[PDB]
Amino acid sequence: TELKQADQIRTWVQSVLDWLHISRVADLAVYIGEKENADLFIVETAALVHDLIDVKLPDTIRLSVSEVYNQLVTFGIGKEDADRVIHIITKMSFRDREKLEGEPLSIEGKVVQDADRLDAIGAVGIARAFMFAGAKGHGLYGDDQSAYAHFFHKLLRLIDMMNTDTARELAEERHEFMLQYIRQLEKDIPGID
Amino acid sequence: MTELKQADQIRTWVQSVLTDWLHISRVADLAVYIGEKENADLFIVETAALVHDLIDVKLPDTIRLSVSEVYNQLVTFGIGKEDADRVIHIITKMSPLSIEGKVVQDADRLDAIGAVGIARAFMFAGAKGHGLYGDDQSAYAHFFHKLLRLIDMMNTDTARELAEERHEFMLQYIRQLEKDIPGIDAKT
Ligand code: NI
Ligand code: NI
């Protein structure tokens, strides 16, 4: 029954969307949730739908909290599960959540937040940061909105904001690679700093 | 030196026209470096390096210049007609090739590989609505179709030696992505 529901939710979210990012985060959250003894169905479902309500979305695609909730109930998902998924997605998406350092999140929420931050670092994070700059018309370097300045202002600090022990061990290799990339960039572009 | 003043004059004009500049500035410095090693005419190398994008179809119509427009400005700035002709001949061929043009092309290709080349490919993908991976238009495909071939297309020995270390770092980056995104190669 749970393999059917997860498939229904995966289809529904794919048709709406970006998908590649969310699919990747869903898979990484289930891996961490396994090592962290989290409820795995909760972890996967919330990872698949947490972006659906995000404010950084146009009004044409952005669903409300009630709309997502009712869709889960219509898919057949139980009351305890629905509520817990809603708790995760609301606690991740209020303004300046970062002030509370993922402390109000349950173990399931923590795991979903960690996968999200892991997707923003290493080789994949480097890629996403530069795509974003290209999409928003920002520069490579030499500027406070540039992708280069985003490394020092945000991306290199993320390793110290992980919630779970497994996420912290997974971050070490990714963070190390960013430094090697920055190093290579600094000799590819003499005077970048 | 008259060469120094003339080059400064060109730099200020190009930077003024493009309001990207940062890319063209790197490529000019790298071209001068390669040219010095290869015994090419450095003034021609630097000047061709600075103006060749101005006529490239990439640039928007609100900024892009014709060949004669580039020619007229060079002559107005005091560059001789013999030098102006050589530069024009280089930048039209690029858009076979002389020693000076081979050096400039090599510098262009080098800015497309290594760390800076990884950055530039992903920026372009975001700009045109392309994905990270998944189809023939994505940044990942662009590595395998184009950017990893560039080291076989270097004209000079100097550039080739410089390409070695950049190409290898790029291969380490692909390796890192394959590790962090299991199944990246077959993903739709
Ligand atoms: Ni996200
Ligand atoms: Ni160029």
What does it look like?
The PDB classes it as hydrolase. Keywords: HD domain, hydrolase. The assembly is dimeric. The structure is a homodimer. With 193 residues, the first copy, chain A, is mainly α. Helices cover 65% and strands 0% of the residues of chain A. Chain A binds chain B through residues 18, 20, 24, 122-124, 126-128, 130-137, 139-142, 147, 174, 177, 181, 184-185, 188-190, and chain B through 20, 22, 26, 29, 114-116, 118-120, 122-127, 131-134, 139, 166, 169, 173, 176-177, 179-181, 187. One nickel (II) ion (NI) binds at residues 27, 53, 108 of chain B.
Multimerization state: homodimer
Q: What small molecules are bound in this structure?
A: nickel (II) ion
How many structural domains in the coordinates of chain A? 2
Count interface residues per chain for the largest interface: A-B, 30 and 30 residues
Counting DSSP E segments of at least 2 residues, the number of strands of chain A comes to: 0
Taking all Cα atoms into account, the compactness measure Rg of chain A is: 18 Å
- According to CATH, what is the class of the largest domain in chain A? Mainly Alpha
Q: Label the CATH architecture of the largest domain in chain A.
A: Up-down Bundle
Q: Secondary-structure element order of chain A, as H and E?
A: HHHHHHHHH
Secondary-structure blueprint:
Two copies of one chain form a homodimer.
Chain A: H1 2-16, H2 19-35, H3 40-49, H4 65-75, H5 79-92, H6 107-118, H7 122-136, H8 147-153, H9 165-188
Helix pairs in contact in A: 1-3, 2-3, 2-6, 3-5, 3-6, 4-5, 5-6, 6-9
Bound molecules: nickel (II) ion (2 copies).
One nickel (II) ion is lined by residues 51, 116 of chain A.
